[PDB]
Design a protein around this ligand. Structure first.
Ligand code: FES
Ligand code: FES
Ligand code: FES
Ligand SMILES: [Fe+2]
Ligand SMILES: [Fe+2]
Ligand SMILES: [Fe+2]
Lengths: 182, 433, 433, 182, 433, 182
């Protein structure tokens, strides 16, 4: 439950690998940003662990306690089924928080690709700004990083997601909801 | 300013009318601080938040920040997080452990009791350190939860809670081991007045009975079994307190919208087997049929809200008439099996968090209401609080207290009723039960 | 409060002085929401915004959200977008077609007239339904424009407009087929006071005849030219409504000032040929040389502003004394050829838009004044409104009403005087024309 | 006309083309962020169409009516001529809205390149945050996506702009103006 | 709302109590604007910011925007950045050189002296131009520092300064060439009341010689050593003005604490050498041992602050009660050599900038205090300002005026008392020395 | 002393080099965002000039004065030695501004690489958004650009920083401090 600097590989991923992942994230963002929730959902693997701990203000001495843990509450801590119900809710004619829907942009940069022991599975670090605009005048700006495990897959995106941890740059949430996906 | 006479007219439980101005007047908010928040019993969390000595937790009482710290003698002190020299925040992190509290501005140090025990350069400059410590605030406990209060004149916690205690226990007093708080305090900002948050947990099951959670419901049933066959709960009752504007409400005979809201393993624990019956006998000393009693909501005026069955519990810290912070957390039976403690954590995340399949729709209404109340016209006419007006009994077989139908506004009328009293009656003499 | 005598100290149409405090003062703004916005006829849009049964437009009167919906009987009703139970927004979209409106909170259904038709669980908690529908507004149409008013006592629309109507007609009455709104309503937030916006469109050509639009004009002329080939237009007039603080201004015989804004094709359509001749005939009753009039600006008090030949039209929604939202659209004659409608669309977007080459400069002044008014000394001295003082005459050969020079503040004073009256006079008994 | 997910090609752009296009945008952003309005304008072809539709809150029932169409108002709907008007205004000493000028940053990412029927012509998708600081303390943050048609050009940057549609993540604009170019 | 009885009881100079509400009260602030900034002498900058004819700086007197601009006759006029027609900002950049000032709204033109010289279309629509120029402020210089006052009735500069003058002299009068300002004016927004920042520079070394700047000291000392090897200074004194609310505080005989801040080379300049001798040889009529005075902190009431050793100098522009803007700059002696100027520059940026190793911690205190003053209980009981009570006296061999010990809240008392004396007494005849 | 559009070279950096510099900044952003101050400091060479000028509102006519000059005040004007002191502070347990510390996001894009006269030493231009959330509810958002001189290095990231000029999109700072590094 303590994160620290991402352990980038010493030799960078080849130019092909870096591009493929990058393009995967840009495709991902287009799906989300255009509310194609179902096609987004289809990216998640059976074993998915979608996680986003709480952060707290800690004195330096108590820095190893910055993030919430596995036996604590999170903003998200999901599996395929819990993700499906969330998907189910957000697409509902009668789910008010997203009818009318929001307007978001997922801006992806800082993509670091690390190869795992398993070929075709990769550990990926990236940074994001998520911009959510809503109702008449509501703007919520989110920032953080994503820690993904991604497998090559034969969907039109070229990858699927096995694990996503989201380090949101927030203690208390400045927004009234998290109706969006990271 | 706002005359006692004016305040009285803002609420009327007789005809059932609320002046929409209450959720929006700045003057009424600031008076709410002095007369409601500076004199009430405000939830701070659980004992299990500060187990060891020195263990603290920065939190709030209205718009005053407080340190709730564990003591040498295993008691719990609570004081204003403000060094009386020139104002500085004394304790500057969210949670942790302390042997000392230093004030970074000028050195003035403090101990976990919250007493001023050194002032750098005492003699060359200066005064009695014992009379210049952080304004102390009264502390008390009920079956786990901590509450606090600034006013010496106010009725003790046990008295203040009144006949609401039978209903609180349904969550808390289910074992002699007690409840424990799963670590981590969820926090988010909501642009909406506190009383909607308070009222929704008091009387409003109506929202769940109708439209708000149609999406929440839809989420927890297979792709084969689709919502074109919707079964809405009918039977259940609502509690109004004898005093102090608390309240609760629940369904009876209906494991319907608890199996879909919380999964099987948690229903088959709240309702069936050894651990279920143990609870009924611990508190069946009020005739309480607690095993058939699901989906309860409850508030302890002003701002302690929780869903006993479900176990999420929160304090709405006021941030002006247009804003509140939800500081939520979940509770478990301390002796409960781990698998059920995981099921209680997972579900309080899926359902009652910022991105929660239920909470989202909960906050939306209040969000969208607060926007409307900016207008002159939208504040110039009474709001309809008339559900079950004068229909609630003075006594009931299965449930104590002033008790109505589950879909009603009797608790709500009580809530705004007590709200009005505190705002109009400056002398505790009159207000005490 | 703010004594009735002190409000009259603010505007002095006689000496031509304004009190800066009217733009900044919060207590005045709260007064305005009641004594101006609560009583006034306010523009909501155009009939063509809601052409079919059910079609609606979510907009605002003051800070109150309203719904404008077309009925079975082809009438338009306007009601507060506030459910009366607890306040929830009943219409949550900007626009579209509704078979009915359902509140998402507790499920109180309504029909397209805003009548409450179904409270779920009515028998089991209740109360006459036909007296808890949202507050309805008065609704009045003038040649396509939809106005609204809360006050049952206020003068009707025709009377409220007075001798402003011939000038509105220059825009609105040119063809028997009337005006249609181009689709799209553009909205943006300007951090200034509504009275700046409203005054400018009421009586200020001065800003155009001098420094504000130098770069806009430059953008309108061919690349080989600059401001050296750009003649400052000096011929024209200004009208102060007989009652109501409405006003207009226009150049006479200066077609090049229109050319730089709207381009050759629209300039031709407005001034020459069958359509323009038809417009002069239809408005023969007014006795105005409509064909020679260009640059026209107008405000129907308090906040209905449009530029006749250009056909941009907007409502300034107030949002505090330091802020407005601009809700702008554009009209075209419904029988104007496609090419002309398209030129109208294109030139409005180029000129009168958050990004428009004129609009950018119109708002910049307003914004910068509003920051200045944050200071004490900034507010402590009257502003000069003496332009064309006592030079305005009631029997002009060409244009009817109280009429002076184009570069004048008579209609400015007119606006501010009526504003004061409406703020100082609580009874329509004294206020009506 | 409704928008929907950018139809990326399944065969991704080669690495060299991916890079040329990204560099193009980085230089474009440098030009605008340094107020080289004349140099920027030189990039626009004589048949350019520059379009920013309005956006509305629409119930899922009516979500096809989200953006204004081709015969509706828009925040920008421009030809080479009208664009030139706007450059003339913003570069003018007597253009008050932008004298003194703002300080802008056009952060660009999510670049997805697609081919067209025409040789050396490309349809390009990308995301942006445009940050605008102005006066003493005015800050406006915009996000959205752009859909361009770029043509290889014999000019300073590599490409010319044939078409640009900007989908802005906004309904009501929070900014008092759109004095900046996207 | 606030009678001059209650204003009296906010600050108590005799007991050493201050009412927390003086930092947070919206109404007190509005009165602050009028009674304090409205008529106090205010720091705008230094003469060298506007050295040639027409050089201007756009700055602030309170929340009032002002332009400070050199004239052909070598003097400096100051005037309100507000056109009296409709309130537009007249000067629109931070600084530079005008040969004139024009209003962008309607073209009212002005000479560099603020005199209205041309109104477009004057003979067509109008009135004396001489009576409609922007409001002037009175302007006084003190060895480079430019001050301005609106009130023609307030005392002149030297009398406003009084006996606070010689403690200013330590920075300003060191040589007969006089100070110059290093180019650049740094600016940031701190969410904290102005009085705190003013107080801290008046009578708050206490923070320096305790907990605040431990990090900052650590950042100045060689890589080879830690905090422990060393000792924080104790020998020094505090000044309080006979009249004004001003206060300086300094150390004596401990050069090491300046070495930690400004580096070997500048500390050399301040304490040893020909120029540091020419200093007292000019500061004789003060009888001050200036070569032994290090780490001076000063405030000229209400918002002019500096640190005579370091030469950082700033106005705190008020932006509400919950906010300020720091406008900070840096002074050097004009004939001081190039290397000494540069070491000042580097060390100012290093320590006193928005990211400076010292300044960061100064502001962070204030930020968190104000956050506290939101709540009611945090505003209920008073704040301790008892330090050094009655220990200061009229006679002191090396230090003029009312002197005490360095670690005292005595200068603090006279500031807050003079604040109280400016918020109550409305006529200058009673206030003037 | 004014800045002007980055002078990008006619011939763009090779794909390989483009990527090494990008990765470098992504790695640098991780160090800072995870408070590895000592690791970050170690990237700074002997002769580092770390500079962040003041930015002013000027009339277009006086546009050459927009930025503070070499002998004026600045937000940052640093040597190895003064940077050290600053790191001394940021990491100290008595550094109140950053204990408890902030949560930052360094989002990097628009990376333009240019050879110098010396081989293995590059002049690099890039855009950033830096998101600093701290304490309960404070958010500060910075946009700007960086002009770096980077030397190839036998360290963990691949490069050392010889020069950094930060042009911040701000005149008056909206944040109460600049505790963070750029
Ligand atoms: S305020 Fe805590 S020591 Fe000065
Ligand atoms: S407020 Fe609309 S149904 Fe309850
Ligand atoms: S506002 Fe200055 S000329 Fe009108
Ligand atoms: Fe609910
Ligand atoms: Fe205009
Ligand atoms: Fe200090």
């Amino acid at each position: 439950h303590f994160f620290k600097t991402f352990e980038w590989p010493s030799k960078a991923a080849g130019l092909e690998l870096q591009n493929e992942i990058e393009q995967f994230y840009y495709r991902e963002a287009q799906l989300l940003d255009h509310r194609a929730y179902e096609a987004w959902f289809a990216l998640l693997d059976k074993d998915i662990h979608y996680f986003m701990p709480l952060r707290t203000n800690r004195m330096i001495r108590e820095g190893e306690l910055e993030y919430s843990g596995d036996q604590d509450l999170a903003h998200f801590d999901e599996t395929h089924e819990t993700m499906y119900g969330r998907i189910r809710k957000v697409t509902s004619d009668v789910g008010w928080a997203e009818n009318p829907p929001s307007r978001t942009r997922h801006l992806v940069s800082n993509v670091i690709v690390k190869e795992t022991a398993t070929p075709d599975t990769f550990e990926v670090n990236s940074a994001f700004i998520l911009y959510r605009n809503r109702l008449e005048r509501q703007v919520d700006i989110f920032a953080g990083e994503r820690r993904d495990v991604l497998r090559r897959a034969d969907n039109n995106l070229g990858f699927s997601i096995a694990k996503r941890t989201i380090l949101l740059d927030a203690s208390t949430l400045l927004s009234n909801n998290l109706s969006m996906f990271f | 300013n706002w005359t006692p006479e004016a305040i009285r007219g803002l609420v009327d439980q007789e005809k059932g009318l609320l002046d929409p101005r209450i959720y929006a007047d700045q003057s009424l908010y600031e008076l709410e601080l002095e007369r409601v928040f500076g004199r009430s019993w405000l939830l701070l969390g659980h004992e299990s938040h500060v187990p060891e000595t020195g263990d603290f937790l920065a939190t709030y009482m209205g718009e005053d920040p407080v340190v709730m710290v564990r003591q040498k003698d295993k008691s719990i002190k609570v004081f204003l997080n403000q060094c009386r020299h020139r104002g500085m925040r004394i304790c500057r992190s969210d949670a942790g452990n302390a042997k000392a509290f230093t004030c970074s501005y000028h050195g003035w140090a403090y101990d976990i009791a919250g007493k001023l025990v050194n002032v750098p350069f005492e003699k060359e400059a200066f005064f009695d350190k014992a009379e210049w410590g952080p304004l102390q605030a009264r502390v008390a406990t009920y079956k786990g939860l901590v509450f606090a209060n600034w006013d010496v004149q106010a009725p003790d916690l046990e008295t203040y809670l009144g006949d609401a205690r039978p209903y609180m226990d349904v969550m808390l007093d289910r074992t002699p081991a007690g409840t424990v708080a799963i670590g981590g305090m969820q926090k988010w900002v909501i642009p909406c007045n506190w009383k909607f948050a308070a009222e929704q947990f008091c009387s409003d099951m109506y929202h769940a009975g109708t439209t708000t959670h149609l999406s929440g419901i839809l989420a927890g049933i297979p792709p084969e079994m689709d919502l074109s066959q919707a079964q809405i709960p009918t039977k259940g009752n609502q509690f109004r307190a004898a005093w102090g504007g608390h309240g609760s409400g629940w369904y009876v005979d209906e494991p319907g919208s608890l199996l879909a809201v919380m999964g099987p393993k948690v229903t088959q624990y709240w309702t069936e087997g050894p651990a279920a019956e143990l609870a009924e006998q611990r508190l069946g000393h009020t005739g309480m049929p607690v095993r058939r009693m699901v989906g309860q909501h409850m508030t302890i005026f002003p701002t302690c809200s929780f869903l006993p069955g479900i176990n999420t519990i929160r304090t709405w810290h006021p941030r002006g008439p247009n804003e509140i912070e939800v500081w939520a957390f979940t509770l478990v039976d301390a002796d409960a099996p781990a698998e059920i403690k995981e099921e209680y954590r997972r579900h309080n995340i899926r359902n009652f968090s910022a991105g929660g399949v239920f909470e989202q729709d909960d906050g939306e209404n209040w969000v969208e209401i607060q926007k409307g109340l900016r207008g002159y016209k939208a504040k110039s006419q009474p709001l309809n609080a008339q559900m079950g007006l004068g229909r609630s009994q003075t006594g009931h077989p299965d449930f104590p207290g002033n008790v109505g139908y589950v879909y009603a506004e009797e608790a709500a009328r009580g809530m705004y009723h007590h709200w009005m009293r505190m705002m109009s009656e400056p002398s505790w003499a009159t207000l005490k039960p």
